Write a protein that binds this ligand. Structure first.
Ligand SMILES: [Cu+2]
Length: 123
C-alpha cells in the first residue's frame, strides 16, 4: 500500500516539515510525497539506510513515489531545507540491523532535536 506524506512550508513541528515525519511501512509499501508547497524534495541522508537500498534524490517541487523493499530504518532530508530541519524517518518491516548506525549520524542542533522524538517513538 501507499502512504502520502506532504512537503510543507508550515506544519506540525514548525517551518519546513514533512507530515507525517514518522512513517511505519511494510516491505512492498510505497510513499507518495506530495508537493503541497513548492520548493521541497526528498533525498537519502547517507548513513541512514539499510545496505542495498537505492539512493533517492527527487526533483524539487514534483510529486514523487518511493517504493520500499529492504526492511530497516531510513532517514530522508529535503535538500534545500536540511539546515532548517526538514527530515523524516521511515521504518520498514521489523529488521533493526541499521538502527544504531542510523541514530549515530550527527546533524545540526535543530535537525537533531527534530529526530530525537522520532527515534524515541521507534524504540
Ligand atoms: Cu523543503
Amino acid at each position: 500500500d501507499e502512504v502520502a506524506v506532504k512537503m510543507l512550508n508550515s506544519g506540525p513541528g514548525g517551518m519546513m516539515v514533512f507530515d507525517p515525519a514518522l512513517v511505519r511501512l511494510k516491505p512492498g509499501d510505497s510513499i507518495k510525497f506530495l508537493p503541497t508547497d513548492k520548493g521541497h524534495n526528498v533525498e537519502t541522508i547517507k548513513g541512514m539506510a539499510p545496505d542495498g537500498a537505492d539512493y533517492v534524490k527527487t526533483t524539487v517541487g514534483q510529486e514523487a513515489v518511493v517504493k520500499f523493499d529492504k526492511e530497516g530504518v531510513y532517514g530522508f532530508k529535503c535538500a534545500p531545507h536540511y539546515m532548517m530541519g526538514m527530515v523524516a524517518l521511515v521504518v520498514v518491516g521489523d529488521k533493526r540491523d541499521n538502527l544504531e548506525a542510523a541514530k549515530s549520524v550527527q546533524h545540526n542542533k535543530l535537525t537533531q532535536k527534530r529526530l530525537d522524538p522520532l527515534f524515541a517513538q521507534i524504540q
